Design an enzyme around this catalytic site. Structure first.
Site, PDB file in Angstrom:
ATOM      1  N   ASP A 117       0.877  -1.194   0.000  1.00 37.19           N
ATOM      2  CA  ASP A 117       0.000   0.000   0.000  1.00 37.19           C
ATOM      3  C   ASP A 117       0.903   1.230   0.000  1.00 37.19           C
ATOM      4  O   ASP A 117       1.502   1.547   1.031  1.00 37.19           O
ATOM      5  CB  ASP A 117      -0.953  -0.054   1.193  1.00 37.19           C
ATOM      6  CG  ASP A 117      -1.998   1.038   1.166  1.00 37.19           C
ATOM      7  OD1 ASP A 117      -1.912   1.921   0.252  1.00 37.19           O
ATOM      8  OD2 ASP A 117      -2.862   1.025   2.081  1.00 37.19           O
ATOM      9  N   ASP A 122      -3.352  12.067  -0.782  1.00 39.26           N
ATOM     10  CA  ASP A 122      -4.793  12.086  -1.186  1.00 39.26           C
ATOM     11  C   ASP A 122      -5.160  13.513  -1.632  1.00 39.26           C
ATOM     12  O   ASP A 122      -4.510  14.463  -1.155  1.00 39.26           O
ATOM     13  CB  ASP A 122      -5.685  11.652  -0.013  1.00 39.26           C
ATOM     14  CG  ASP A 122      -6.889  10.779  -0.353  1.00 39.26           C
ATOM     15  OD1 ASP A 122      -7.118  10.521  -1.544  1.00 39.26           O
ATOM     16  OD2 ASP A 122      -7.576  10.345   0.597  1.00 39.26           O
ATOM     17  N   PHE A 145      -4.728   9.055  -6.023  1.00 43.01           N
ATOM     18  CA  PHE A 145      -3.650  10.076  -5.946  1.00 43.01           C
ATOM     19  C   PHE A 145      -2.291   9.381  -6.056  1.00 43.01           C
ATOM     20  O   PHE A 145      -1.434   9.828  -6.822  1.00 43.01           O
ATOM     21  CB  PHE A 145      -3.753  10.922  -4.676  1.00 43.01           C
ATOM     22  CG  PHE A 145      -2.605  11.884  -4.513  1.00 43.01           C
ATOM     23  CD1 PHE A 145      -2.571  13.066  -5.244  1.00 43.01           C
ATOM     24  CD2 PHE A 145      -1.523  11.578  -3.694  1.00 43.01           C
ATOM     25  CE1 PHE A 145      -1.500  13.935  -5.123  1.00 43.01           C
ATOM     26  CE2 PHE A 145      -0.465  12.469  -3.557  1.00 43.01           C
ATOM     27  CZ  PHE A 145      -0.452  13.641  -4.279  1.00 43.01           C
ATOM     28  N   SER A 180     -10.407   3.593  -5.557  1.00 45.21           N
ATOM     29  CA  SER A 180     -11.565   4.449  -5.935  1.00 45.21           C
ATOM     30  C   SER A 180     -11.082   5.652  -6.741  1.00 45.21           C
ATOM     31  O   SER A 180     -10.002   6.195  -6.444  1.00 45.21           O
ATOM     32  CB  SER A 180     -12.323   4.922  -4.731  1.00 45.21           C
ATOM     33  OG  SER A 180     -11.487   5.692  -3.878  1.00 45.21           O
ATOM     34  N   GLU A 214     -21.152  11.430   0.447  1.00 42.94           N
ATOM     35  CA  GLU A 214     -20.637  12.772   0.834  1.00 42.94           C
ATOM     36  C   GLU A 214     -19.754  12.569   2.062  1.00 42.94           C
ATOM     37  O   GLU A 214     -20.088  11.675   2.898  1.00 42.94           O
ATOM     38  CB  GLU A 214     -21.768  13.758   1.159  1.00 42.94           C
ATOM     39  N   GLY A 221      -8.617   3.259   3.252  1.00 41.30           N
ATOM     40  CA  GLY A 221      -7.624   2.454   2.527  1.00 41.30           C
ATOM     41  C   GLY A 221      -7.028   1.392   3.426  1.00 41.30           C
ATOM     42  O   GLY A 221      -6.718   0.280   2.927  1.00 41.30           O
ATOM     43  N   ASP A 222      -6.849   1.726   4.704  1.00 38.09           N
ATOM     44  CA  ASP A 222      -6.139   0.839   5.654  1.00 38.09           C
ATOM     45  C   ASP A 222      -7.029  -0.363   5.964  1.00 38.09           C
ATOM     46  O   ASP A 222      -6.512  -1.477   5.982  1.00 38.09           O
ATOM     47  CB  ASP A 222      -5.707   1.602   6.906  1.00 38.09           C
ATOM     48  CG  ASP A 222      -4.719   2.731   6.643  1.00 38.09           C
ATOM     49  OD1 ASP A 222      -4.036   2.704   5.609  1.00 38.09           O
ATOM     50  OD2 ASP A 222      -4.626   3.633   7.490  1.00 38.09           O
TER      51      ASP A 222
HETATM   52  N1  LIG Z   1     -16.619   8.795   0.067  1.00 38.36           N
HETATM   53  C1  LIG Z   1     -16.648   7.482  -0.124  1.00 38.36           C
HETATM   54  N2  LIG Z   1     -17.821   6.884  -0.445  1.00 38.36           N
HETATM   55  C2  LIG Z   1     -17.845   5.546  -0.586  1.00 38.36           C
HETATM   56  N3  LIG Z   1     -16.855   4.666  -0.438  1.00 38.36           N
HETATM   57  C3  LIG Z   1     -15.719   5.291  -0.100  1.00 38.36           C
HETATM   58  C4  LIG Z   1     -15.540   6.647   0.091  1.00 38.36           C
HETATM   59  N4  LIG Z   1     -14.231   6.917   0.455  1.00 38.36           N
HETATM   60  C5  LIG Z   1     -13.665   5.735   0.517  1.00 38.36           C
HETATM   61  N5  LIG Z   1     -14.501   4.710   0.147  1.00 38.36           N
HETATM   62  C6  LIG Z   1     -14.269   3.265   0.185  1.00 38.36           C
HETATM   63  O1  LIG Z   1     -13.060   2.994   0.866  1.00 38.36           O
HETATM   64  C7  LIG Z   1     -12.103   2.354  -0.020  1.00 38.36           C
HETATM   65  C8  LIG Z   1     -10.713   2.919   0.204  1.00 38.36           C
HETATM   66  O2  LIG Z   1     -10.757   4.363   0.202  1.00 38.36           O
HETATM   67  P1  LIG Z   1      -9.844   5.229  -0.763  1.00 38.36           P
HETATM   68  O3  LIG Z   1     -10.164   6.662  -0.590  1.00 38.36           O
HETATM   69  O4  LIG Z   1      -9.842   4.601  -2.111  1.00 38.36           O
HETATM   70  O5  LIG Z   1      -8.391   4.989  -0.151  1.00 38.36           O
HETATM   71  P2  LIG Z   1      -7.464   5.834   0.860  1.00 38.36           P
HETATM   72  O6  LIG Z   1      -8.251   5.817   2.152  1.00 38.36           O
HETATM   73  O7  LIG Z   1      -6.188   5.031   0.951  1.00 38.36           O
HETATM   74  O8  LIG Z   1      -7.258   7.191   0.282  1.00 38.36           O
HETATM   75  C9  LIG Z   1     -12.683   2.568  -1.426  1.00 38.36           C
HETATM   76  O9  LIG Z   1     -12.258   1.495  -2.250  1.00 38.36           O
HETATM   77  C10 LIG Z   1     -14.192   2.574  -1.171  1.00 38.36           C
HETATM   78  O10 LIG Z   1     -14.699   1.266  -1.043  1.00 38.36           O
HETATM   79 CA   LIG Z   2      -4.367   5.322   2.327  1.00 37.56          CA
HETATM   80 CA   LIG Z   3      -9.100   8.682   0.075  1.00 37.33          CA
END
Ligand SMILES: Nc1ncnc2c1ncn2[C@@H]1O[C@H](COP(=O)(O)OP(=O)(O)O)[C@@H](O)[C@H]1O
Ligand SMILES: [Ca+2]
Ligand SMILES: [Ca+2]
Ligand SMILES: Nc1ncnc2c1ncn2[C@@H]1O[C@H](COP(=O)(O)OP(=O)(O)O)[C@@H](O)[C@H]1O
Ligand SMILES: [Ca+2]
Ligand SMILES: [Ca+2]
Ligand SMILES: [Ca+2]
Ligand SMILES: [Ca+2]
Ligand SMILES: [Cl-]
Lengths: 282, 298
Positions: A117, A122, A145, A180, A214, A221-222
């Site tokens: 990871d 972000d 990102f 995402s 929203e 992600g974690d």
């Molecule tokens: N605003 C959101 N609405 C719906 N699902 C979300 C949202 N933010 C994160 N997720 C979910 O959490 C997962 C990981 O979040 P993401 O933003 O992709 O990673 P990170 O937290 O590492 O930036 C996504 O694959 C999705 O399933």
């Molecule tokens: Ca992350």
């Molecule tokens: Ca994120």
């Protein structure tokens, strides 16, 4: 039993990021989580004040010497890395994974699966250190990102998500999940991409969506990557991704009823009701 | 009010300290805010032990982050385990008193401070002898203490060898100012197949209520057992009377040790084999298959 994970992530006393997000889900699924805490902080970088300790290279190598001396390195069927934010430790993690592969090979165990990871941001020393580390990863789980800054492609849609993932495969990561990205042409959804390169040189690609809630959620992600390791142990990667998406959607929706209450629905961490369709691309 | 501040060790390999305490408290629905006093490769039983140890400055640095963010009034429970640093052990009394004032300020019930005076086992001190005196001073401010027989012996100066000597050691804790003491296990000369434990509760009248019970003895040296026990005790004491909380925590430890044996962790097995199987039966951490009787003494 090969449900044994070395998790090299952050520790925080208050809240659910890094090893605090990852450990309870994996333990609930019957994994032993052996954590190296790259930092030991009061809380995540959302709160007004952050205090605590950051591991240096010497602390990391000292811990490794203890693991190596007591003959534990062959135990790690899985390596899961997140928050490191240190060029010399990112580089050292490659040596650690190579030493674990060697120890498992000599004991004739199944090859370790390194889930990388690439935690960076972000919304350069370290970016380049992750480009090298990813040459030895089995699975990478960048947010949109991280996928954009590593590949140099702006991930804004499926076409550009595919270009980013192709960069990962050329770099030597066989399996990529871009977790995402928003779509101008579909504002109520987030799209994910699972990209699998074989060896044959061929790529199998899979996609799907989740509702776009929203608001801003920490540790998503974690929890996702930890959930992906749990499900991918016994499920094909496409179905593992669907279950892992289903877990995050349960947790976000529960919060809606910023901090994910990861420990509040143990049932849903193991068996979510949301399971996202994960469909092959032609 | 199911929030715990847990000040214990972190180990990468195996099951002691915060790693062993956190999973059961989480299953019982607690938020565990963990301060890791050390970050080590494994517990001290192994030939090699490597990693980082907090000094007082590292501990007060974390406390400053928890203070500035207004987290201290969240802590309905403080649980301390492995510290083995005289300065940090000394600083725990000020931390607890600061949490108590912060709770009063928000109209919350008082915190309960559970002090596991983690200093060694099997007649062997883990670190420096100066830690013993620091724990005598901290224990005056503890609500609940959970020494093993070795810790009860070096603190009180009484060799805990049987029920009479456990009771004398427990009376030392009450005089020191600890109202509730569990001496978690000691030998029965007339019964080598069981371990005996003592719960002692000083009121206020200055009267003491004493309880005793037994658990099946398993041939073999297990570690992390006290850590799971005290985490289980906090969890069950939240919604049970202390005597029943002790009996449930003893039942948790019986299931966990039998699961460790069943998975190859017999007396003669490696240290790695004898590591407690904390993730093997999550249901049995919440709902143990037995509950030890905790029976009043005269
Ligand atoms: N605003 C959101 N609405 C719906 N699902 C979300 C949202 N933010 C994160 N997720 C979910 O959490 C997962 C990981 O979040 P993401 O933003 O992709 O990673 P990170 O937290 O590492 O930036 C996504 O694959 C999705 O399933
Ligand atoms: Ca992350
Ligand atoms: Ca994120
Ligand atoms: N060998 C054993 N056989 C049976 N029960 C044990 C054994 N070792 C530990 N226990 C259980 O674990 C609990 C705590 O272990 P103990 O050795 O008293 O504390 P510590 O781990 O702090 O040294 C005991 O109260 C008992 O219920
Ligand atoms: Ca013991
Ligand atoms: Ca007192
Ligand atoms: Ca102990
Ligand atoms: Ca009850
Ligand atoms: Cl798209």
């Amino acid at each position: 039993d090969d449900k044994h994970v070395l998790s090299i992530q952050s520790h925080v006393t208050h809240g659910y990021v890094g090893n605090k997000a990852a450990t309870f889900p994996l333990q609930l699924h019957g994994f032993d989580v052996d954590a190296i805490n790259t930092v030991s902080l009061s809380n995540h970088s959302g709160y007004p004040v952050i205090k605590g300790h950051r591991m240096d290279l010497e602390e990391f190598t000292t811990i490794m010497e203890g693991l190596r001396a007591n003959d534990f390195l062959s135990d790690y069927a899985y390596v899961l890395t997140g928050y490191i934010n240190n060029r010399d430790i990112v580089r050292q993690v490659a040596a650690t994974v190579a030493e674990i592969r060697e120890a498992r090979q000599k004991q004739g165990k199944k090859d370790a699966v390194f889930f990388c990871d690439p935690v960076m941001g972000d919304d350069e020393e370290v970016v380049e250190a992750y480009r090298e580390l990813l040459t030895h990863a089995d699975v990478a789980t960048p947010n949109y990102f991280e996928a954009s800054i590593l590949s140099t492609v702006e991930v804004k849609d499926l076409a550009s998500a595919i270009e980013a993932a192709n960069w990962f495969h050329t770099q030597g990561t066989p399996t990529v999940v871009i977790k995402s990205f928003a779509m101008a042409d579909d504002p109520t959804h987030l799209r994910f991409l699972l990209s699998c390169r074989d060896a044959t040189g061929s790529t199998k690609r899979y996609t799907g969506v989740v509702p776009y809630h929203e608001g801003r959620y920490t540790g998503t992600g974690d929890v996702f990557a930890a959930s992906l390791v749990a499900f991918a142990h016994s499920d094909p990667m496409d179905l593992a991704v669907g279950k892992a998406m289903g877990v995050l959607q349960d947790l976000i929706k529960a919060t809606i009823e910023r901090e994910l209450r990861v420990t509040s629905y143990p049932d849903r961490l193991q068996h979510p009701s949301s399971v996202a369709l994960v469909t092959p691309l032609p």
